[PDB]
From a paper:
Here we have shown that the infectivity defect observed for HIV-1-N74D viruses in CD4+ T cells is due to its inability to interact with Cyp A, which exposes the viral core to TRIM5αhu binding and restriction. Although capsids bearing the N74D change do not interact with CPSF6, the infectivity defect that HIV-1-N74D viruses exhibit is due to a decrease in Cyp A binding with a concomitant gain of TRIM5αhu binding, which restricts infection. To explore whether N74D affects the conformation of the capsid hexamer, we have solved crystal structures of full-length N74D hexameric capsid proteins in apo form and in complex with PF74.
To investigate whether the difference between wild-type and N74D capsid conformations occurs during core breathing, we used the small molecule PF74. To this end, we compared the structures of full-length wild-type and N74D hexameric capsid proteins when in complex with PF74. To further understand the inability of N74D to bind Cyp A, we compared the structures of wild-type and N74D full-length hexameric capsid proteins in complex with PF74. Decreased binding of Cyp A to N74D capsid was additionally confirmed in experiments using recombinant Cyp A protein; in this experiment addition of PF74 decreased Cyp A binding to both WT and N74D mutant capsid stabilized tubes. Overall, the change of N74D structure when compared to wild-type could potentially explain the loss of Cyp A binding.
Numbering used by the authors:
A (entry chain A), B (entry chain A), C (entry chain A), D (entry chain A), E (entry chain A), F (entry chain A): 1 to 221
């Protein structure tokens, strides 16, 4: 991450061992379950692209995912370059160059250049921009390693409603969908794919009911 | 959370890895037992809505609960909007907008906007307001995942009184009730649902006795 | 707890995750053995009543005890109110009210009010006053969950003296007694309830002997 | 590592116990898998050559590797000496000497000399230079303890594509290759060495496809 | 422990949870082996008598020892009182009283009084004085729970010399003895109680030999 | 260790619980393997002789070693005294005495005296001098508890070369030898004591080959 030093200057903070071990443990234990993302985001708050790279490099295994991640990073780095053309020429002495997509991703930029941009007034938030891309890739990975689709989730004959909902929202959390699509999957699927005895009750509760109500209503069978 | 920096400015504090791992462990180990709430409250002291969101996002599983939580958040966000109408128009340059319910819940607001409100003089405590709502939802969850009601708690024939009381107060802690309702459940149920041998003794101690006294009095059988 | 900020002002310190997890572990592992009290006292040093409440709320189980604890808190809160009558009227604008027993216990007081009192010049140490009450209740709990009395502790025929003493002082630590009563239990019981072979020796050492001496003297049989 | 003290002066920071234990655990658990490198780099940020030496010295076992490491360090130290000839003579009183390769590697230099160079204006970044060499050696070790070559990686008849890719990129991460060579191994091998059923599909997707697409396309068989 | 605050004043530092848990673990795991003492001393550096009391109170079990500890504390507190008579009278308003033995042991003194003495110019180091007494008691305990005497340590027929020495110095570390007595036990016992084959060799090495030499000399049989 | 306080003065830093527990764990788990030394050195950076003593005192067991350690300390303390004669006389009021060997080892010196010397301008680095001696003893211990000599290390008929080298360098790390002696053991033994099939190959590589090359060359059999 980054802080201002004793005096005026602005210095890099080494990522702690705890922050590191935590990120590695998350991944060993949770693979690419959705909750990994928040965790990465949390553990990376204030990060430079180096740091972010570091963090990603500390994962062993999941290299298929990691390659998808790079391709997503790449995809975005191109789009950045296209929206912000740079001017290759005489870079005015000790004066800051404009970052390219590769400079944001850390491949063509130093830590010192990175800090430089991040603490500029006004700042170029290269860490956050790189972070946004990384999370994009992380979503994709999450979808890809979701073993089931929302359409394959039906309540079991003898499955309490609470657990169907659990499985449904869990599955739903791991989908490619805008918010509007998830909403739609909910409105269409949740009641439809409930089992017969509970489905009848819920049809009767009508479309304005809360989940608390739905669960209450299917409690007794 | 939030602190004032080296100099005048007011900066975000990343939630630590310990605070994170602790919240995740709590939930893996305790599901939605009542004590989870304090723990969440403690681990979240000083939090911005982002942070709170982060914390909630780091839980995998319990997605039925988490959906109830959102609906409760939503319910409250509406009520806020209704009690505080905002004026959509020209937001005066670099000047702070009034938060909506969605801005409090973090969905339509940035961290920078959030800090802004939290450290304003006089402040809009958006973290505490969002926290209050989240705890509301957390109570509801707690009730919903309580597998037994206070009325189903009777002392076993051969159950020491100490343990009946344990089960009764534990059950009672997980109920929807104002303080006045819990009091009432106590005054009506605790002695009534004690087993015969202990019940006689307690009727004889009379209604002003403490629990220490009650336990003392049923010690010997 | 509480500290003075960067500048002049006096701010709340969130109780750490370590302090929290430690208190929870203590109780899971030790129930209400005497040593729990020091531990609570240590983990709570500098605490506001909120914090103390937090800590107590984080224990799941032991709810019979916790109810005794509240009754003891209540008992004390009444006594406080009786010794310090407050004047209900126009609370002079932004000026500090006198705390009631409920304000000390945290039920009718905010954190901000609490800090206010704790850092007043001269201060009202509401945390320490609430702490003293809580420890009182904690003693009572300790006595109540002590499964044996000092009078039931006799040295086994083939029990080395060292271990009898261990059991005796352990039992003695968990009693309701002033210091003078414990002293008395010692002077009357320890030698009397030793087994015959060791008892004879100790009668011969006479009443001024130390425990080191007593143990030395019963070493050889 | 290094920080500026209370006042003007610039002082050494002891490497923490956590940073140490973490590095030792990494190696016990992961031997010389690629991810070890980032970890070492992370745990060593800001390090003086002493510290780096310390860290390396704390590994027991892997002494064949460690000897390769020294030889690589040595190789580099020579190259440094050759590119930067020093002038042996009267070292001007309390004035800084130019570092040799051995002074960078820590063998002929003190901590005080090391700090001196690192915080000079303009600085001689001896820690980073030594770090770069150490990582070079660490790469070599990584290659040497890679038990399989990229050419020996073929998808199993009944191996989902996802896992072949995993094994391929993992193997590829542990190779001696410029970026251009890895690219080349990819373009030549990945599709070629896929199993027949998946290979046909991928030939049909054509050379511009992403891995996400490739995995999508071989999903269904 | 104790530190000077933000501004001029001198404030108490709560003993950390780590320092606490560490002391409790030491004792659960090591009982009263000699090394416990250093550990206690280390964990208690800078402590007030409250803190020290706290630490001692956090041990459950070993109550026979703990009672010996109090008697030793008591013994010393008396001796202090006798060497430093106090003058009971009008304690000059807000002016510091002279500590008694009970004030040093914490029983008749507050934390505020304790800090007061510890940071006085010139200081009364009540923590160190109480610490010295506590360690005295701790030595005694150590001796008392040493199950074997230095005279009972003979090298086994087939016991390598290294291990005899280990057992001998370990036993010797747990004895009541001035330095001069330990020296004497060494000079008299170590060689004498070695087994015949090794004893002959050592007699021949003569009285100026080091242990390194002794071990070298008995290596080969 | 040591730091300058809030204001001008220079104060002792208690060794942390983590630094302590870490040193104890190292030794329980690793006995006197070579890597223990770095670890001790790392964990002790900035230490006063008290602290160092503390650390050594916290090890239980290994008392034969610890006695060798003292003798080595003693040996060195004598040599110091002989090279720096002190003048016993009127020690000029509140003025610093010259340290003896016993004052460096901590036996005749206080912490306050120790800090005094360490922070003097110009300083007497008593911690580093004592540390150097302790490490000397630690080397000796390491040699003594090395169960095998470099001459007894031959490659197994069916032992990959990598593992022979591992065993050889590991053994070599635990020897009494100047750098020049180790070099010599290498040049003479490593190839000579390799097994026949690998030995022939290595003779053919010639004396300038690296270990990387040697391992490469014996890879294939
Ligand atoms: C955890 C989760 N499950 C989902 C299933 C489908 C789609 C999204 C999700 C999410 C992420 C998810 O939406 N998380 C919430 C935070 C949150 C988590 C858990 C309970 C309540 C609030 C979030 O990030 N935001 C901004 C948010 C905050 C309030 C209301 C709605 C959204
Ligand atoms: C822990 C608990 N069990 C209950 C059962 C029924 C209703 C509520 C509860 C509670 C929460 C509960 O009431 N917790 C207490 C704190 C507390 C916890 C444990 C012992 C003593 C004090 C609390 O939050 N407040 C403000 C409080 C403080 C003093 C007296 C009464 C209330
Ligand atoms: C630990 C313990 N066991 C008891 C048995 C009967 C009554 C009380 C106790 C106690 C608490 C107990 O008395 N603890 C001691 C601290 C202590 C603990 C252990 C050894 C020495 C000193 C204490 O709090 N104080 C103020 C104290 C200090 C010195 C002398 C006497 C009392
Ligand atoms: C982790 C990994 N696997 C490889 C296989 C072949 C070659 C190299 C590697 C690497 C290291 C690897 O390339 N790591 C990445 C960081 C990274 C790791 C994981 C996912 C995305 C980005 C890196 O260090 N840099 C500078 C980088 C950043 C963005 C794009 C490309 C490279
Ligand atoms: C650890 C130990 N074992 C003993 C056996 C008999 C008597 C005493 C002991 C001790 C304590 C013991 O003497 N510990 C040493 C520290 C120490 C520990 C281990 C190795 C070297 C130095 C100590 O405290 N001091 C002041 C000391 C320092 C140098 C030389 C001699 C004494
Ligand atoms: C770890 C080790 N194994 C040995 C075997 C024989 C003799 C010595 C050793 C050592 C200690 C050893 O030499 N450690 C190295 C640090 C080190 C450790 C591991 C790999 C590379 C560099 C060291 O302390 N120094 C000053 C050093 C630094 C660079 C080159 C040569 C020496």
């Amino acid at each position: 991450p980054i802080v201002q030093n004793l005096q005026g200057q602005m210095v890099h903070q080494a990522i702690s061992p705890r922050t590191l071990n935590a990120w590695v443990k998350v991944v060993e234990e949770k693979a690419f379950s959705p909750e990994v993302i928040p965790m990465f985001s949390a553990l990376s708050e204030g990060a430079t692209p180096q740091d972010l790279n570091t963090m990603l490099n500390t994962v062993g295994g999941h290299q298929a995912a990691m390659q998808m991640l790079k391709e997503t990073i790449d995809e975005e780095a191109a789009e950045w370059d296209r929206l912000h053309p740079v001017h290759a020429g005489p870079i005015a002495p000790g004066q800051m160059r404009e970052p390219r997509g590769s400079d944001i991703a850390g491949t063509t930029s130093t830590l010192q250049e990175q800090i430089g941009w991040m603490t500029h007034n006004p700042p170029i938030p290269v860490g956050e921009i790189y972070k946004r891309w990384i999370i994009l890739g992380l979503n994709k990975i999450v979808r890809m390693y979701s073993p089931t689709s929302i359409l394959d989730i039906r309540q079991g004959p003898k499955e309490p409603f609470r657990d169907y909902v659990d499985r449904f929202y869990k599955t739903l959390r791991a989908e490619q969908a805008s918010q509007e699509v998830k909403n739609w999957m909910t409105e269409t699927l949740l009641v439809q794919n409930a089992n017969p005895d509970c489905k009848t009750i819920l049809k009767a509760l009508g479309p304005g009911a809360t989940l608390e109500e739905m669960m209450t209503a299917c409690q007794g069978v």
